[model samples]
Structure formats: C-alpha cells, structure tokens
Target: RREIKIGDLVLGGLFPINEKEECGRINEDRGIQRLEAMLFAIDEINKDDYLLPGVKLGVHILDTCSRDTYALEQSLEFVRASLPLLIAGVIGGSYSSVSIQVANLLRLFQIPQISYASTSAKLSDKSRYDYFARTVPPDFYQAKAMAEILRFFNWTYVSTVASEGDYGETGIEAFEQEARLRNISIATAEKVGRSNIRKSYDSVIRELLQKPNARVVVLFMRSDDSRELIAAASRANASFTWVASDGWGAQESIIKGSEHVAYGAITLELASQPVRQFDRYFQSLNPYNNHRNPWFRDFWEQKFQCSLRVCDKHLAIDSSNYEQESKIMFVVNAVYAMAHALHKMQRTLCPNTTKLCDAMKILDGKKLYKDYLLKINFTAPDADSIVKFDTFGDGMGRYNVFNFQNVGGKYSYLKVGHWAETLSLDVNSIHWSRNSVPTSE
Candidate 1:
C-alpha cells in the first residue's frame, strides 16, 4: 500500500505495513506508530511559521510488507519521483536489513535515508553507507551495553540466538567482540533465519536443554520472530533469562499472553521519554478524516476489532499502555533533523525570500546529505536532548535498561538503568523482585 501528498518539499517513508511473511496481517505496534510520527512531525513543522515558512511538507509512503525484497522494491518508487515533486529525503526502513538495501539504492541518488530503529554495526561504515543516517544509535553501542550488563552480573558465559542477518547476526557479533574484551566467554550460539522461525525451534530447544549452566541467552532477534521463539519455548516447557536488543525491548505486542516467558528478562530499549503531546494528537485522529494515509483505516479496524460504521466502541486506542514503541521519539528526531536541515539549506540558499527561490528549485541532495543533514544540530523536540550525527551518520547512543519484573502479580518492564553515548552505564536504580538473578534451568 502507498500514499501520496503534495507539498513544496516531499519526503518518502517506508514502514512494515504487513506482518512478517503473514502476507496480510498488520503491524499495529511499529508500522502505524512510525507512519503517524512522520505525519505529525510534518504537520508540526508546516504549522509553524518559523521553520520552513510558506512551505508545506509532502510525503510518499510505502509499505515494506516486512521483507527486504519487498522493501527494496517499494523503495524503487522513490526514484520515479512522486510526480513532479522530487523527494528531498526518505524517513525509514525500520530494520537494518531493509535500510542497508535501500541505502545502497539511495546511494545512487544521494537521497539520505534516516532510520528510526536500525542498529546494525555494519551501517556505521561511513565510506559504504554515506547516504544512510539514523536517529537511533548503532548496534556497536548496544553491544557495549549488553557486555556491561553481563559484566555487572559477573556472568562468565552466556548463549546467544541471532536471527541470521544484518540486525541480528551483526548485533550478536558486535556483542561477542565486546563480551570477549570484558573476559566473558560464550557458551553457545544458535542462528535462525528471518523467514523460518519455527524450523530451528527443535534444534535450538535441544541447545537450551543441553546448556543448563549458561542461564542467560542473548536475544538478537526482531520483535515478531522473538514472539514466535518465546512461544516455542513455552511449548517445550523450557526457560532462560534473556537480555534482548532494542528490537524486542518493551514490545508488549510480542509478549502479550506470554508474560511469564519474559518475566525476568532484561532488554536494552532505545531511551525515550513519554510524549503527552503526541498522545493527544493520536487520540484526536478520525479514521475517515485522515486521508493522507490509506493504512490508518485498516489499522483502526484491526486495533479496535470493530468496523468504522459500527458503534460498538468509541474510545481511541491508547499506546501509553506504558508499553509504547521505544523508538517513537527517534522517528520524531528523524523528521526534525530533516526539517532543521531543510531550514538551514533554505536559509543559506534563499535568505531574502519567504517562498521557494530559484536556487531552491534545483537542490543537490548529496550536498544536503553530507553538509546539512549529517551536521545539523538541534534540541530534539520530543526528548529535549541535543540531536547530532557523527562522521559515520550515526546519532547519539542511549538506551534504557528495561528489566521485566512481576510484582504484585503484575508483569511489566521497569527502567532500572541507562547506557549513554559517552560509553557509560548507570545501574544504581536497579531493583529486583527476587533476592537473586533468575538463573533459569
């Protein structure tokens, strides 16, 4: 599915509208959350007279269907130029796998692709992925955080499960390098394909049963695949304390009915603050009124489990189940970075005009990518943190240590620690429900 809007400057977006290989199932948690953020960010900038004055931000968004091939294919449309307007930039491809492919494609055009959730270490190579930038930090930093936690627990060995691609394999590989540096040894590692989650279940279950001493399992799997793997664990009646990547952190959708499986797991989620303003903006939306996105109606129908015409329910779905997407602010960050970059480009090229000038009509996206987009700095509207990218087009690394705890018969992730871009880890606030770490058998 795709959507098109006309404006003075158009930006493209890619989201996993369809579930992983489900062909038709929806991605309620990540897909719509990001798409809406892009819309909200654009609307916020357009409404402001200061930023991009007399300018409107347009979009051409496409669904990735949660596959690299389809995502790359959908990204091709960005080349066709959404009619007469050229896309100044692109906003996403949430997974590192898709972003890697699309970034390669955009390298030909120098249209920067700013991601909200990609964390592959391979993406940090400035020479190869010059056109790729992200609002979230790379896996290199998350790998350091994972190693610090393992060191804190004084665990010498742990098993790992990698999803066998850029996001999973590279993240686990980065952690291995860091863990080795910290004198921690790996007990075992199980690799699974992104497409075939169930095929490796039996073999990995045997590994889990075989390695009873290494109670910790590093999870480098994406959210949907992690859900399936956990369900498989419960079916086999096996358990382990998992330290997960941001891809699986605080994702209520992945662990909905299987809370017991992740009861004591630790996840390094992207550090994000609650945005009450975005929450109210989301609540005010109407299914029929928001025509800019064609996917919203489908999301609404599936989320509420009621058709639009039916009067069964009236309350809008609340994302603040307090289990909101950890990467939402990064989405806002990506938009703001682009808007700020555009503001700078406009200011330098057309300072005397309120509208698009002759020089602004034909802009060099490569110069924008290298000069303004990568170097642009501003106070992040959502997190209030200073947002800037390094020479590799990577953003400030920050993560919240989300420890899953069950207290008073309620299970939820508590932010007990933090790891920042400065290579520092803070765990003084860590609180556990149990006297000892849940060293599972």
Candidate 2:
C-alpha cells in the first residue's frame, strides 16, 4: 500500500482522494463493476484521511450500457455539465469507441479521463486530451497475444466471429492483422450481432465448419453473447477450439454460467496478482473478516452482492483477486500520478484542460506512486510505452498481452504476448489445430 504524508494528513499516496466520476455502466453491467472497483479503491485510499482536511471524497456514477452510443455521448455531456463542481478526473467506460468519444470531449473540456477496460486499439492515438489513459491492455496487445497463442499451439488456420460493435470491429481488425504477421491462416471470418446473428450464425458457422483448416473459433463479443455462440458451435460439433478477448474474460459470467461451452477456452486481460499482503493488512483492520485462506470470489460477492467482474470488484471489495485488483490498482495509481503532476505543476483545477493535459505527460517524472505496480511512465509527451500511436487516423494505443486460465477454480495468469504495431490480415493462413477434449463427467 502506498501512503502519502501531506503535512498533518496521511493519505494512501498511491491512491488519490478527490472528486471522481465513473462514465460507464453503473448497474447490472460489467463496465459498472469497474466503476464500483474504482470507487472502492479510492475509498480505501482515503482511509487515512490524506485528502484535503475537511473535504469528503465524492464519486458520481453514470451508465453507458454496452451498445448504447447515445448513452455514451450523454455520459460525456454530463461530465462536461458537471465541470463546475471541481471534479479532478474520471474512471469509467469500457468500449474504446465510447472512451474515444469521452476522451475527445474531455480533451475539449480539459478534463482527465481514465478507462477501466476500453481495449479498442485506438485509445492513445487520437491524442485528444493527452490526459486520456486506461488501465486495461489495449486490443492490439491482446491481438498479439492471441496470435502468439495460436502459434504456440501450432494453430495455422482459424475462424473468427466478431460482433458489429466498435469494440468488436477494432479488436478483430487487430487480431487479423497480427495473425497475418504470424503467418497464420484465417479460414472463415463472420460478423455477428443482434441484427445479423440470427440470420448469419447458421451460414457463418456452416461455412466455417466446412473449412478444412479451421480448428479454432475466436469470439470477440461480450460474455453473454459469446456463450450463446459457443453453444451454437457446440451443437454443430464444430471441431474448432474456442478463444475470446478480455471482453469475455469475466470469470463469473463465462466460467460459472457457460461452464459447458467455455471450459478450456482462454482470454486475455491486464495482468495482476492478488496481493497476499493486502489480505493480511485488511484482516488486521477487521479481524472477523476471515483473512486466512481468503477466496476473492466469495469476498467480492459478500461485499457487492454481485459476482465479481473486472470493474465492479474494485468498487465492492478492497481486496480482490489479481484480475480485479489490476484494474483498480491502475486507477488508484493514476489518480496519484495526476495529483502529483497537478501539485508539481501547481495547477489545481483552473479549468484549463490544456495545462492538465501537459501535466499528464510529466506525471511519471515525479515517481510519486513508485510503490504501486503498473508504473506511471507515461512521460513520453506523445508516446504510449506499451504500443506506438497513430495520430492522424484512429486513437489506438499499445498494450501487452495477458493470458488468463482457471487453475483449480481460480483464474490464473498464463502468459504475456507481444505488442502489435500495425494492422493487416492474411485470411488464408489463419487456422487452429484441435486439442483433445477432456472428459469432464
């Protein structure tokens, strides 16, 4: 835990205690969970009362349900409308398109925005506010990782099913490009969604099944929809394997509900390891909480009444497993970075976002939150250390791949993949080699 000692107030130095808002789903959605986690992390950070003496931390949450462009736009507008309230920053929004929109708006309005999971390949590119950043790995990074996984298994040809949303399109584009670079073959590629799936899955899956080289099914959609697609494939006896992006990596939804179809499937995400020390420290605070042999899933459910997801766990329970902890840890560290940058720049909410934007580039210079993981090294002024940026076209950023697997009922990190720099698809070489299915009964 990072602690900040400011004069008489000792605040968690790694966490920022200030007015923050979540700009994505706030209830009954995966993105909302991220908002909850951020709030919880901030609260935990403020336990030492290190923020300005008398000011109580404030968190305003708004929802942008997945696939609701209008809701996303509205969230950005609301943030702008609330600017007069001295809000220092924001942490929310899952879709990269929404994050891009919010980032553009924040840049125009000069507010800082951080996303929990906006893995679109084009976040750090548009360069809207310079202050725009995210905690999750970018899509391209995951794409590179997926490509590596395919290569690791000697998978040469594969089929892809992507949604018609911004996240899906951007993610698939990256995946295909990386697949091509790896000399893999793509036997079948289909786009599915509420409007087209009912009409297309039959033909798409049929065509894919006919492909002699297709051995894997890469789904780029939410967990809810992906489960149905996997079920469809299961019924068809599609010999292809299955994989997904971080979007489908929520353990509760995919692992618990889609156990039959999702078993042995893999996905990628921002890597994190649950801090054993955090459990010990938290238990010390509340002895009855049962620190010994703590299960992150049960703890998260007890705290939020919702099964743990990437975003919500942070807001619900302070102690989360690796997956949940990484997201919150990023925001917590980001807040500290922003505050330190602002403090060093001596510009505390002048409403001039340009200055704040400039401040973002220098955040890493202070080494303020060195104790926290995911080092705040965004000092390049125009570079995302994880991946390069394309300023003229899309707002993509660089990311490292994270492979996630469930070992003994607990999700564990499997591996990290390379960073992708460009996009191109080789439809002929993408393929998957079949692995023997394990008998579960």
Candidate 3:
C-alpha cells in the first residue's frame, strides 16, 4: 500500500520487502537497495534536463514480499491507476516466478516489466512474455557456463540442490541437461522449499551429507535457502565444495557467520561494479530529506539501532561501510533503459511540446513497449555496456566468477575469472580449501 506518487509518468516496483508467510520481516538486502536504486534513477532523471525534460518519472512501489500470488494483486493496482500519474512500466519482483506471474497479468494490458534479478530462461519466451524483459542475463547461459566450469575442473560426479520454484527448479533442470551433455553424472538431485523451509531442507542436507563420495554440489538456489543449507552443514561440521549458479551470486553477507561451511565454493555472478554516484547518495540518505519512501524511516531505525521521532538506542549507523547490493547496477540500468524508452516516445509522438503534449500525456502501454522499449540500443552512461533487448527480450549476458577461499582470516568470495563468449577461468589464481581440488571419490 506504500507509494511515492510524483511526476508525469509513474513506474511500478514490486520488491520482496517481506516474503509474508504470515508476519513478514524486512528484507533489507533484496528490497531496500533496489527500491532506492529506482528512486535514485528517478531523482537523477528529473535533475537532468536532457532525458525526460520537464516530464517527471514517478514510481508506485509495492512489496511482492517474495510471493507471486500477492504480486498479482499488487501489480493489478499498477494497471488500475493514473491516480496522479500514468504507470508506464515496472522494474521489479526479484524472483522469476513472481515476474512470470506479474507478466501474465501486466502483459494483458502491455505494461512492460524489466526485472532486475529474475534469470529463469522462461522469461525469454517472447510469445509468452512479450512485454517482459530483464536487466540480468537468463539462466540458460549461466547453466551452460556452469556446466563448462564443471567440465574444465574434470569433476564428473556431483550432487544438485535447487529451491523448489521456477528460479531454482528451472535453473537446475537446465544445469542437469548441460552437465549430461558434458558426460557428467549427478549422484542425487534434490529440491528444498523456499517459503516453507522447515519442511524440506533437513532431508536435503542429510541426503547430501550421506554421500561422502560426492564432494561437489551444484546449488541452483537463492541466497536465503543456500544460507540455511550451509548453516545446517556447519552444525554437522560437514566439509563439501560447491559450484553455485548466479542466484547465489557473490554476496558475502549470505554466508557471513557460516563461511567455513562454504569454503572453496566457486560462484558465477552477473558482472557488476559499484556506482560511485549512487553509493555516495545512498550513504548519506537521511529520513529528514527523503520522506517519499515510508519504508526509509523504518529501515533507518532498524539499521541504525535507534528510535527516530520516538525513543533511544546505542551505536549510530556507519552508512560509510554500507555494502552495495551487487544487483543495484542492473536496477539502475533498468531505470536508464526505461528512461531512454520514454525519451524516444516523447521525440516521436510530440517533439514540439516543452511540457507533455496531448499525445504524450496519454501513454500507450502497447506502443511504448513494442515501438520504444524493445527497439532501444541504449548505452551505459560511462561504460560501453549496451542495453538492447533481443527479439526474446533478453539483454546481453556476462558473468563474473568468484572463488570462496580464505584470504586473510575468513573465507571470502574473490573474483578469479570472467565469462562472456567463453569461460575465462584463471586456474592459477584459485585457492582450494582442501589444498588441492577435492575428488568426487
């Protein structure tokens, strides 16, 4: 029900603020950073006279809470309004299933969605998800790359675990097929529940640990599920290596306390870097200045450990050391791509108008998506990274490889290679926890 209603064209954001099984807690890492990335894009777009000109790009952000059925309801509201401004497009719903569900509803009206994180290859189906697109590459590419990574290491026998949903289920399926193509055999393929986890993961962990012969497990699960699985392994003091897909990315916080359990894990993350401008803006973000997002005050109180406009607590927020969510760049790029799409519409529809013209005032959801959004060949502000959607509505894909080996005192995911056309693995740079590559045995 929270909104930041501003500008002429409002974009909707569906984030997993809380995956409400019932009473949901704040998902600071996934939700807050991305929501603000969209806000940051809008602020910058309005500030610049070049992009939207006088036309402000407002946002109607809602929490999916990591649930698709809930997202369907929230997204229905996106199409139902021009309450103050017209909603042209959306930039969210982190999970692939959430995006697919929303796309089914949103595409009925041609409301385009560019998800920041969802990588399930099914989203690339133009016939089904015509108005749908993504900032990150699809899972098929990552699966191929992961399969290649396994082959390169000469690891033939392995186990697989996926979150029992589209992102993991489909991703693992792709990996399974790719691994078979490389003559690799899976000893056990398991599924762990994402929302209702007390149900499935223990048996998953037990089945995985039972096979001491299978030293490597390919994880096609998201951060939370992966963290819980690793935490359980830590309880048993188990030692097994991992080759994780992009869903596990390279987020250190996911394995902060449970680092030892994941030693020698190699992960493939979407190639990304820090945005200096956004980073600086985010570090100094205060409730006094930014009140548009109602969640900011709540996040501030929790993050800083103090009651603002209420009570007291110890330790001021060290926003200086705030970790940038790696996926923020994709969300930022999604905003820019949408901005470019809007700019193109303005030039073609009403070039003469300073303010939004009669034609520009009333937005065409279908025409905007088909004519403007799809045809865009937008470039990144600084880098040569172009944001163009292929006929399938998927962007150019690249990956950064991370090796989780102890650097100083604790295990850390260090960048060891990159993947574009082929896997550019720097084998010499890898530091295995076993002192040598552990055999499948």
Q: Model 1: residues >4 Å from true position, as ranges? A: 82-84, 194-199, 309-313, 319-323, 380-384, 421-441
Query: What's the TM-score of every candidate structure?
Result: 0.91, 0.62, 0.91
If both were scored by lDDT, which would come out higher, candidate 1 or candidate 3? Answer: 3
lDDT of 1: 0.80
Q: How accurate is candidate 3 locally (lDDT)?
A: 0.80
Report the lDDT tens digits of candidate 1 across residue range 28-144: 768887788788888898887887887688888888888888988888888866334588899998988889989988888778789988889888987998888888888888888
Best by lDDT: 3
Question: What clash count goes with each model?
Answer: 0, 29, 0
lDDT of 3 by residue, 289-395 (tens): 77777777777776655677553433333455477787888888888888888888888888887577898766788888888887555444334467778777787
Candidate 2 on 290-351: residue-level lDDT in tens?
A: 23212233334544556433434225224453233344444444444443343434334323
Quickly count the clashes in candidate 2.
29
